[PDB]
Amino acid sequence: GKLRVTTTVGLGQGWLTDKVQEFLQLYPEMSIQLILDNEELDVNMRHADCAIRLRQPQQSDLIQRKLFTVHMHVYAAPSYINRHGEPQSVEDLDNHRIISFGEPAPNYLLDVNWLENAGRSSDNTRIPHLQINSQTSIKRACLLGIGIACLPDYIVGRDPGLIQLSLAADIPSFDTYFCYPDEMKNAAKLKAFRDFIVAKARNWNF
Amino acid sequence: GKLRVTTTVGLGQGWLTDKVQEFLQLYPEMSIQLILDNEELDVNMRHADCAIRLRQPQQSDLIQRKLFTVHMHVYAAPSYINRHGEPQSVEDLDNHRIISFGEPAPNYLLDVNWLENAGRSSDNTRIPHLQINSQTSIKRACLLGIGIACLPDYIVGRDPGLIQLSLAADIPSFDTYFCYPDEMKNAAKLKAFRDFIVAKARNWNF
């Protein structure tokens, strides 16, 4: 039968789709609905059967497990570096083209505009060359050599084709969580998907 | 300066990001914000400066130009066909794994669940093996050989790596439109982007 899984658009497009292929090869009598939303769909309102969240769920009636820690890094394409050079510091970004998410951003999507704010006051941010409210499109724009991007590891992947820039600055990491309502704890379809996702998350050494 | 452009998530990710790279190479003193939303953001409320719509705008105060006609086709990966065979008809889909968008779908996103409904009554739809409310993730799932997908040409592209399936059924085509408020008609930044997008749309023979 059908399991409904909700997560953010970025995590759904960048990581979860490929994991669902691996899952459906193991459980061919299951079907999955991925509901990708940057608004946190209420799992208890039965919009989904489970969720992957980019922050710790605060609802006391959700069973939760930590999955993996996400790191944010700064990237550029070879085709950008070959034309514009490599920035050595956060201050060198003032001479570079930056790509960011823009506003509005979801309140739990941390540091998606980090390149605009890094080393600057909130009233004197960097002017981005491109903004796109889609992490996969920011990766695409970065690969096309439009500019420098700040991206999570689950978007970039193990073989990015991107140079990681060492700007002598740390971007905060955050934890991902699998969560589901107590009503679903005994459903075989949810146990199968939970235990698969927890196993895949532990093996996700980026 | 900054131009804000809104469109659907699918068109933004599948086509417009690559066109914005070409645009920003021509107009390096401009910046772009892409605002990707499947809800039709109101351009007259100044949420954006212009839009690309998948239906004809009904607002009488919007200047509009038809861009291109979009065709929907059915696709499978070589890795799917090599394992499951090729369906020869719409009825053969009953023995196949289908990938669809799911519900809720936006009211202007026509036929994103066509594979569920094709040759069936509304009360006896096909059970999809996978649903994802993201056209780019449906393409990815199709390329991974999860199942058969119905996709627009602007998602698939000229070199899809996908087999187009001839199911002896026509899926309705729809037109795309560029639109902007009359207030913006004289802005140099909007003229540049409009005339570029209109030229790119005419050259988009899929």
Residue numbers in the entry:
A (entry chain B), B (entry chain A): 95 to 300
Task: Quote the paper.
Unlike many bacteria, Agrobacterium harbors another redox-associated LTTR, called LsrB (LysR-type symbiosis regulator B). LsrB is a major regulator of various cellular responses, including the coordinated regulation of small RNAs, ABC transporter or β-lactam resistance genes. Agrobacterium tumefaciens LsrB possesses four cysteine residues potentially involved in redox sensing.
To experimentally support the biocomputational structure model, we employed cryo-EM of purified LsrB. Based on the validated 3D structure, we were able to localize the two pairs of cysteine residues (C144/C273 and C236/C244). We calculated the distances between the cysteine residues in each pair and found them to be below 10 Å. In contrast, substitution of C273 led to increased H2O2 sensitivity reminiscent of the lsrB-deletion mutant phenotype. When LsrB was reduced with TCEP, which breaks the S-S bond and converts the cysteine residues back to their reduced form (-SH), and subsequently subjected to modification of cysteines with MMTS, which “traps” free thiol groups by forming mixed disulfides, peptides containing all four cysteine residues (C144, C236, C244, C273) were identified with MMTS modification.
